[PDB]
């Protein structure tokens, strides 16, 4: 619920070590947490907030050029000058090119001409700055259990619905206590501060589409920066970069704009972040979070109830969804009240006894009537199996066959485990919980190799990454000691891998 | 007396959007604009869940075709040796100054 | 000759035939049929949201 067929969803099976589980929440997917007991909570992280902001510089895309009134002097009555340079809103380049007797020296040669253009802009970047305080990552909680996929309707934004629960966690108030009526209060403690390394990311405006970029990138743009303090009379530093004075070889000088540089700036943004803004925030997609999810306070809700009665009519053909579960949604007819929902995956029927480990524990229907409306999920075994609730006369049975083998789930799972190591990595070891001398020593080594690596090979586009990959490969086929060849080939191989994993 | 050999549009105005949204194993989404000529289309696969509402789950095959438009094209105007010219000037110092 | 707006400069037939932008052919009557178009109008999506 709230995450099904959502793809990047990762379910964590069992917190372990005393109701403590830490998880990394990235917008590109979900995390559905299932314990030995307690409802199966489905966490999905949506959006991000940008708060107060601030402006840093600006950049002009488009240059109006007017005036250009020129001044020339004799071969010797110094170099040229005219009143318009003290204006500082103009741009002038004194180039010594002209000739004698034409204009008038009686002194063949040289000449100095100042050419001053009026520089006013039109479209301009603001380039605002982000600081980690005050941005809260909105996060949505969705517990499974009894649910249609709407039908209850009322969402749980404000509450009612009582199945889900919005949490907004900000570095000035982490520990977002979330109250799920009748299940339990799921508290979770997240660090907004340290996840994305903000303060290295300027929030960047163009016309409408907004982006995020490095200060390291954003200070290096060759545009007539502004200082962004205030307007009233914008004072353009540079102006030299965006206008070009082309002197003709035979005689004279021309002022020529470089025209709107707008699109070129789009090209230079390859690999930004796609961003959405509003007046007081600017919805930030992407991102990732780290949170220790505290399962201490929860209850399976109505563990204690009857088994209902006769129904089992199911609405749809379970639908073999991606990665794992066949997500079932029945309508036991005629039930009296808040009674349990029996479900089991049977290897063979025959003597009942399923091994299925369904991920939707203690499912519970609601009130009387008949509209019912309960949706479940069951993880069957890869082989053929029978989906069965085993109540009443002749119940209703279903025949289902999963595909793929434990080997396939093995390779598949490490495939993504690698991508967790690839993007956001060095926090990937935070996906597992209650670690010591396995997951911490691990995250430690990976963090040192990560910092060195990023420091060593920063400045790496995808193509570059592949090249240096192959060079380190070719060294890995040569030299000596089986060390620098093996260390070298190793680190080369990991770039190649991080490249392909970036692309996929 | 110059010709025009091709042109480039250095600006762009997109318009009209829409989208496909057909389910998985419904085959393909149509939306008729891939028929008409200036509407650019790139078919992508939306892994599609129950929110949208379809039977299976997986790559959903939609493409938004937005109608291209242009403004202020740059022309490539071309020439040949014909319809060329020079207009050379002559000096002959002699005795003059200014004419 | 290469005309953008009210300025003009020569370019060979390599830099000029190498440009990725739309082709357009010879003339502009009405509105032309724009060859290519992939260079401008770049559209992709993630999270599988339209």
């Amino acid at each position: 619920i709230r995450c099904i067929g959502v793809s990047n969803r990762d379910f964590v099976e069992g917190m372990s070590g005393g109701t403590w589980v830490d998880v990394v929440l990235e917008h590109g997917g979900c995390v559905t947490v299932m314990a030995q007991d307690k409802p199966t909570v489905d966490i999905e992280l949506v959006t991000t907030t940008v708060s107060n902001m601030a402006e840093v510089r600006s950049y002009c895309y488009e240059a109006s050029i007017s005036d250009m009134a020129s001044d020339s002097r004799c071969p010797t009555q110094g170099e040229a000058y005219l009143d318009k340079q003290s204006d500082t809103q103009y741009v002038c380049k004194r180039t010594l090119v002209d000739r004698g007797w034409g204009n008038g020296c009686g002194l063949f040669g040289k000449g100095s001409l100042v050419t001053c253009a009026k520089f006013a802009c039109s479209k301009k970047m603001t380039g605002k700055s982000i600081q980690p305080e005050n941005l809260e990552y909105r996060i949505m909680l969705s517990v499974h259990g009894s649910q249609h996929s709407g039908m209850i309707v009322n969402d749980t934004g404000h509450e009612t619905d009582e199945n889900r629960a919005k949490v907004e966690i900000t570095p000035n108030s982490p520990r977002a206590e979330a109250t799920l009526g009748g299940f339990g209060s799921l508290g979770l403690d997240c660090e907004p501060r340290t996840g994305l390394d903000f303060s290295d990311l300027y929030y960047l405006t163009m016309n409408n589409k907004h982006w995020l970029v490095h200060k390291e990138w954003f200070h290096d743009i060759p545009l007539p920066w502004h200082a962004g303090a205030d307007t009233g009379t914008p004072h353009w530093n540079n102006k030299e970069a965006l206008v070009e004075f082309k002197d003709a070889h035979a005689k004279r000088q021309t002022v020529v704009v470089l025209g709107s540089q707008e699109g070129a700036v789009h090209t230079a943004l390859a690999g930004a972040l796609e961003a959405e803004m509003d007046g007081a925030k600017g919805r930030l997609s992407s991102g990732h979070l780290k949170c220790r999810l505290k399962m201490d306070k929860l209850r399976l809700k109505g563990v204690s109830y009857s088994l209902c009665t006769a129904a089992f009519t199911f609405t749809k053909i379970p639908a073999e969804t991606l990665h794992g579960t066949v997500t079932v949604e029945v309508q036991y007819a005629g039930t009296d009240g808040p009674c349990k929902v029996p479900a089991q995956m049977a290897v063979d029927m025959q003597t009942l006894t399923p091994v299925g480990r369904l991920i939707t524990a203690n499912p519970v229907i609601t009130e009387s009537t008949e509209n019912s409306k309960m949706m479940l999920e069951l993880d069957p075994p890869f082989g053929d199996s029978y989906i069965v609730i085993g109540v009443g006369e002749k119940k209703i049975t279903h025949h289902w066959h999963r595909s793929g083998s434990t080997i396939g789930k093995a390779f598949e799972a490490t495939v993504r485990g690698a991508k967790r190591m690839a993007v956001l990595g060095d926090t990937a070891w935070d996906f597992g919980s209650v670690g010591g001398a396995l997951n911490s020593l691990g995250k430690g080594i990976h963090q040192i190799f990560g910092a060195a690596f990023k420091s060593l090979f920063g400045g790496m586009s995808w193509f570059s990454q592949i090249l240096i990959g192959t060079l380190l490969m070719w060294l890995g086929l040569n030299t000596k000691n089986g060390s620098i060849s093996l260390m070298c080939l190793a680190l080369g191989g990991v770039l190649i891998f991080l490249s392909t994993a970036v692309s996929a | 007396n110059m010709a025009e050999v091709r042109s480039y549009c250095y600006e762009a105005s997109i318009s009209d959007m829409a989208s496909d949204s057909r389910c998985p194993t419904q085959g393909e989404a149509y939306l008729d604009k891939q028929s008409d000529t200036q509407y650019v289309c790139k078919r992508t696969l939306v892994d599609r869940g129950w929110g949208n509402g379809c039977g299976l789950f997986g790559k959903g095959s939609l493409v938004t075709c937005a109608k291209f438009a242009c403004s202020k094209k740059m022309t490539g105007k071309s020439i040949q040796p014909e319809n060329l010219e020079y207009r050379i000037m002559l000096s002959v110092h002699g005795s003059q100054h200014s004419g | 000759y290469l005309t953008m707006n009210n300025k003009h400069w020569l370019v060979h037939k390599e830099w000029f035939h190498d440009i990725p932008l739309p082709w357009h052919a010879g003339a502009d009557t009405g509105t032309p049929h724009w060859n290519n178009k992939e260079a401008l109008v770049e559209f992709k999506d993630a999270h599988a949201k339209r």
Partner: antibody, heavy 127, light 109 residues
């Protein structure tokens, strides 16, 4: 709990600019929703809508791709649908209804239900 | 894209009535989106269906939806006294726009 009111769309002349307003009441608009469905007397409910939210986006029925627009103002939780040129045939009632928006604030796939509440309706006449 | 449901069908209190909405593969058949709007002459068409069935919170069991291809069958039985209203069938086309059937005004008793 949820109130949707409009101010009446009397009758203009064929060639008139009619603007109808929808005042969201009680229900939080924040990320709210909206729609416009005009039906003429006992008519084929027409959907000339605009999927608006907080962001202010729109998508118009092929029939009003460029005839009418409805800007958002969250100062008063009001949507303004403006159909340029009220010709004679329009006499129908423009209702404003909501299909509350997705979590993300971006609206693509609507909710299973569409319209849980409706405007009072506005009769606008071309005469 | 248009909705052709029937104009008005009559039935006595208690016997069941069936309204048929026939769409395209582009809207009704190729999606689960269907909704039936009860429109009284007086009040705005209000939600009373949504996705085949799933009563919203005014179940008044007597309304049931169904689909068989491009069909939408809202089958009311047990005529609800003064349940007479125009019934409109709606669907989400894939082009991203909504269409509403020509409406079925109903006759009761």
């Amino acid at each position: 709990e949820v109130q949707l009111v409009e101010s009446g769309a009397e009758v203009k002349k064929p060639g008139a600019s009619v603007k109808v307003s929808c005042k969201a009441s009680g229900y939080t608009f924040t990320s709210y929703a909206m729609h416009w469905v005009r039906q003429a007397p006992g008519q084929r409910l027409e959907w000339m809508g605009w999927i608006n939210a907080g962001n202010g986006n729109t998508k118009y029925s092929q029939k009003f791709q460029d005839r009418v627009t409805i800007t958002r103002d969250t100062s008063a939780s009001t949507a303004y649908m403006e159909l340029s040129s009220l010709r004679s045939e329009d006499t129908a009632i423009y209702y404003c209804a909501r299909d509350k928006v997705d979590d993300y604030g971006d609206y693509w796939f609507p909710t299973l239900w569409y319209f849980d509440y409706w405007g009072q309706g506005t009769l606008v006449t071309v005469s | 894209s248009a909705l052709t449901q029937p104009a008005s069908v009559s039935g006595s209190p208690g016997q069941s009535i069936t309204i048929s909405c026939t769409g395209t593969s582009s809207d009704v058949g190729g999606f689960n989106y269907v909704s039936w709007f009860q429109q009284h002459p007086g009040k705005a068409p209000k939600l009373m269906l949504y996705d085949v069935t799933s009563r919203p919170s005014g179940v008044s069991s007597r309304f049931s939806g169904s689909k068989s291809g491009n069909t939408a069958s809202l089958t009311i039985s047990g005529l609800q006294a003064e349940d007479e209203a125009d019934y409109y069938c709606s669907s989400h086309t894939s082009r991203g726009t909504w269409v509403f059937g020509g409406g079925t005004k109903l006759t009761v008793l």
